[PDB]
Structure formats: C-alpha cells, structure tokens
C-alpha cells in the first residue's frame, strides 16, 4: 500500500518529460527505499533509467514492493492538471488496477483527485552500466543544452572527441 508525497508537482512532471518524446510505456518499481523506472526506445539505442530516493519526496511510505506500469502519454495528460506548485500525492494498494493521483495547494479549497488505470508490461530490467569508462566529464547542463541544440542545426550526427 503506497503513499508518496512530492512537495511540488513540478518535479514529477519534469521527470516524466525525460521519458516522453523518447518512450511509450514504463514500469515504475516502488520499494521501501524509493522509486526506480526503466524504459527502452523503439530502436533500442536509448535506455532511460530513473531513481528517486526517499529524501526527494515530502512524505513517502511503501510497505510492499509494487510495480505499477503505465502509458506515459496518458499519465502526462493528468500532469497537465499540474500547477507546478501543488502538493502531489500518489496512492496505490496491494495489487492495484489504478494508481491514484492527488493534487492540493495552499488554500484548502482545491484538492483534485485523478486516477489512471494501470497495465501489464513485461519487465526485462537492464543493468548495462560499466565499471570503467574511457573518459568522464561534467559541465553545466544548460551549456550542454546549447551545444547539442546548435549543432543539431547542421547535422543529424554529432561527434564527441576527447584527446
């Protein structure tokens, strides 16, 4: 029986953008210590791996590992009721047909309750991270944003080279 409270719905909405535009369905594994989710694009050249710990939520309690997989384009439509600054809560039970999404904000007036019906997806979970990589770098995400956006204008094919 799951109950997980994001302090601001913006966060979760933003996290789903990372999957959307590149993946269709997805299993979300909920366990004592948080949520993990994995998805592979159609051509199988991109994997998206998500992990959210307990500390990222406001409240979080999950007393039983539960997979609730779902259509993301369906889920994002519910997220459009988002506000970004609203206190979003996720509820489930032992073996659930639906996840419940629960919005609230500062005035007691506006508590909306949504419900998305779940699906069966076959979980072929993938652990493909290597120990050693040839090179590691980190830079501002906004800076990276620009380089990719810019070079995408000239070619379908960007080449990274470290020497």
């Amino acid at each position: 029986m799951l109950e997980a409270k994001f302090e601001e719905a913006s966060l979760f909405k933003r996290i789903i953008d990372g999957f959307k535009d590149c993946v269709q369905l997805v299993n979300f594994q909920c366990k004592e210590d948080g949520i993990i989710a994995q998805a592979v694009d159609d051509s199988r050249v991109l994997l998206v791996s998500l992990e959210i710990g307990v500390e990222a939520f406001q409240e979080y309690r999950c007393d039983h590992p539960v997979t609730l997989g779902m259509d993301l384009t369906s889920l994002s439509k519910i997220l459009r009721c988002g506000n970004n600054t609203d206190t979003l809560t996720l509820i489930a039970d032992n073996t659930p047909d639906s996840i419940i999404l629960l919005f609230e904000d500062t005035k007691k007036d506006r508590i909306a309750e949504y419900s998305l019906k779940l699906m069966d997806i076959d979980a072929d979970f993938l652990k493909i991270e290597e120990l050693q990589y040839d090179s590691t770098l980190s830079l501002p995400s906004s800076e990276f944003s620009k380089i990719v956006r810019d070079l995408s204008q000239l070619s379908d094919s960007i080449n990274i080279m470290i020497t």
Partner: peptide, 14 residues
C-alpha cells in the same frame, strides 16, 4: 570537470 583515462572519438545521433 574532466578526467581522461583514454582518448575518445565517438559519434551520436542528434
């Protein structure tokens, strides 16, 4: 930041 154990030369789809 960058630490380089090996030179890399790799192409990715935009």
């Amino acid at each position: 930041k960058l630490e380089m154990d090996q030179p890399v030369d790799l192409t990715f789809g935009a």
